[PDB]
Design a protein around this ligand. Structure first.
Ligand SMILES: [Xe]
Ligand SMILES: [Xe]
Length: 120
C-alpha cells in the first residue's frame, strides 16, 4: 500500500526501504530497511545511519546484524521510524559505512524518492 523503494544501489550494496504506517501514531511511518550485497564478499561492520529534515524525527532501531552477506544470501534488516508531524515530504540522507574487501567504505546518499504514500 506504500510502495517500497530502492533507497540505494551502488557498489553491490542495495538498500531497499519498505514502508508501513504506524498503527500507533498515524504521523509515524515505519521504514524497514533491507540491505543486501550482490558481491562476492561480505560487507562487515555495516552501519546504516540516516538523517531527516528538521520537521521530522527519526528513531533507528537495532539492525538485525552487522554483516551484509555476500551473494545476496540474506540481508540486514533495520527499522527506522519517522515521525512527520507536519506531513512534509519525506527525504533522507543516509550514510552507509562498512568494510568490504578489507577496506573501509562509506557513502552518503540522499533518498529523495520516497513515495508520497510514505509521507502524505
Ligand atoms: Xe540496514
Ligand atoms: Xe547522513
Amino acid at each position: 500500500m506504500i510502495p517500497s523503494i530502492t533507497a540505494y544501489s551502488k557498489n553491490g550494496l542495495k538498500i531497499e526501504f519498505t514502508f508501513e504506517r504506524s498503527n500507533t501514531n498515524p504521523s509515524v511511518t515505519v521504514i524497514t530497511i533491507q540491505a543486501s550485497n550482490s558481491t562476492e564478499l561480505d560487507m562487515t561492520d555495516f552501519v546504516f545511519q540516516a538523517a531527516v529534515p528538521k520537521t521530522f524525527q527519526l528513531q533507528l532501531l537495532s539492525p538485525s546484524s552487522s554483516v551484509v552477506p555476500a551473494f545476496n544470501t540474506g540481508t540486514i534488516t533495520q527499522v527506522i521510524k519517522v515521525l512527520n508531524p507536519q506531513k512534509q515530504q519525506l527525504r533522507m540522507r543516509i550514510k552507509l559505512t562498512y568494510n568490504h574487501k578489507g577496506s573501509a567504505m562509506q557513502d552518503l546518499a540522499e533518498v529523495n524518492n520516497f513515495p508520497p504514500q510514505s509521507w502524505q
